[PDB]
């Protein structure tokens, strides 16, 4: 697989259509739509058999995906704000849940 932080065996899922989160106010809705292109659209994960429940799979998927995305982008000079991070966490988690149930189809 791919290597993140000196550990191999990570899987990279196929590009995904980023969801449209409604946050409860027009400003954050608009900020997200205008900035989501700077956020991941594919998630790093490890095979489901390495976990015992969905939450731990997704926690790893979100943590690693955002960590590796920050490294790669900060090579291109990009810099994520406190609200970029909050919005990335929400979108990446949604994609990780979708990835989980997609991987789950093989195990049953």
């Amino acid at each position: 697989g791919a290597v993140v932080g000196g550990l191999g065996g990570y899987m990279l899922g196929s590009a995904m259509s980023r969801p449209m989160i409604h946050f409860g106010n027009d400003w954050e809705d608009r900020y997200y739509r205008e900035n989501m292109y700077r956020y991941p659209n594919q998630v790093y994960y490890r095979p489901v058999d390495q976990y015992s429940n969905q939450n731990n799979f997704v926690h790893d998927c979100v943590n690693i995906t955002i960590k590796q995305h920050t490294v790669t982008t900060t090579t291109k000079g990009e810099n994520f704000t406190e609200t970029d991070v909050k919005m990335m966490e929400r979108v990446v988690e949604q994609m990780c849940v979708t990835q989980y149930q997609k991987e789950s189809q093989a195990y049953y």
Partner: nanobody, 124 residues
């Protein structure tokens, strides 16, 4: 290479406490992240808790948060798991392991050098 040995398991009443210990041979203990897994009868190893090489950051599975506390003494080449408010379903074989890479994760594949394990039985 380095060898890990768990100790401290035993029988405890529900609500009781136990302190598990993970002792490492060698001299590179403090350079690696460390974690704890457990395996209940008829199930596989599941993540319990982890801690960075320096101890600045830690992670816990949802079922043990607020009851278990991970820590380490880099001078004694030892990591600890303090378990309070134990439950019958905390019964399991508990393993310690050495993190692979620089990021503590919850996957089984994030760790190697698994110790032989110690038995924890929570019953009255």
């Amino acid at each position: 290479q380095v060898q890990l040995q768990e100790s401290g398991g035993g029988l405890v009443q529900p609500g009781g406490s136990l302190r598990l210990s993970c002792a490492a041979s060698g001299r590179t203990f403090s350079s690696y992240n460390m974690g704890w897994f457990r395996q209940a009868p008829g199930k596989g190893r599941e993540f319990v808790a982890s801690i960075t090489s320096s101890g600045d950051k830690s992670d816990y599975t949802d079922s043990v948060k607020g009851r278990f506390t991970i820590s380490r003494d880099n001078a004694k080449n030892t990591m600890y798991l303090q378990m309070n408010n134990l439950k019958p379903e905390d019964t399991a074989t508990y393993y310690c392991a050495r993190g692979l890479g620089i990021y503590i994760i919850r996957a089984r594949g994030g760790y190697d050098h698994w110790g032989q394990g110690t038995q924890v039985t929570v019953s009255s």
